Amino acid sequence: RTAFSSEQLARLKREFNENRYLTERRRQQLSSELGLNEAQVKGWFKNMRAKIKKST
Amino acid sequence: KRPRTAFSSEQLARLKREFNENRYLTERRRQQLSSELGLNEAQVKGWFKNMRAKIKKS
DNA sequence: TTTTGCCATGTAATCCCCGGA
DNA sequence: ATCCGGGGATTACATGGCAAA
Ligand SMILES: *C#CCN1CCOC1=O
Numbered sequence: 001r002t003a004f005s006s007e008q009l010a011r012l013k014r015e016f017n018e019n020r021y022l023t024e025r026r027r028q029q030l031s032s033e034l035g036l037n038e039a040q041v042k043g044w045f046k047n048m049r050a051k052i053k054k055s056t
Numbered sequence: 057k058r059p060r061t062a063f064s065s066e067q068l069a070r071l072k073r074e075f076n077e078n079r080y081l082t083e084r085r086r087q088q089l090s091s092e093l094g095l096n097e098a099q100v101k102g103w104f105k106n107m108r109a110k111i112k113k114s
Numbered sequence: 115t116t117t118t119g120c121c122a123t124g125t126a127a128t129c130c131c132c133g134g135a
Numbered sequence: 136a137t138c139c140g141g142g143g144a145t146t147a148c149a150t151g152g153c154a155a156a
Contacts (some may be wrong), residue, residue: 001126001148021141042140043127050143051125060136080132101131102136109133 004044008034012041016048058098067093071103079108 004012011034015026022030022045031038063071070093074085081089081104090097 003126003149040126044125046141047125047127049141053142058136099136105132106136109135112133 002040004036004040008036012044012048016045020045020049058096061095061099063095063099063103067095071100071107075104075107079104079111 015030022042027038027041030041034041074089081101086097086100090100093100
C-alpha cells in the first residue's frame with residue numbers, strides 16, 4: 001500500500017473535480033506527471049467516486 | 057487461459073431450461089447447477105453470460 | 115499533564131458482478 | 136473463451152484520536 005503525498009492528492013482532486021472519469025490518455029498523462037503507476041491513478045478515481053456515492 | 061469445452065446435448069438442454077426461468081445465476085444456483093452437470097462453475101457462468109448477449113442481439 | 119494502550123476510522127487495493135467488444 | 140471498464144462490497148492495514156493510571 002502506497003500513501004500519496006499532499007501534492008499528488010491535491011492534483012488528483014483538482015483533476016477529479018474537472019472530470020471524474022479518466023480516458024486512457026489522461027490516466028497515462030496523470031501517472032507520468034505525478035510519478036505514479038496507472039493502476040494507482042485508476043484505483044484512486046474509482047475509490048473517490050465510491051466515497052462520494054456512499055455519502056449521497 | 058481457461059480451455060474451451062463442448063457441452064453435451066443434455067448439459068445444453070438443462071442450461072437452457074434454467075435460463076428459461078431466470079437469465080441470471082445466484083452463487084448457490086451456479087454451484088448447484090455446475091455440480092449437477094459436471095461442469096466447472098466458470099463454464100456455467102460463462103454460458104449464461106454469452107446466452108444473454110446472443111439474446112440481446114437476436 | 116505524561117505516556118502507554120487499544121480500537122475506530124479512512125483508504126488503497128482486491129474480488130466479483132455486469133455488458134460490450 | 137478473452138479482456139476492458141463500470142459498479143458494489145470487501146479486506147488489509149496504517150494512522151488518529153481517545154482511554155486511562
Ligand atoms: C481495487 C482497486 C483499485 N484499482 C487498482 C487497479 O485498478 C483499480 O481500480
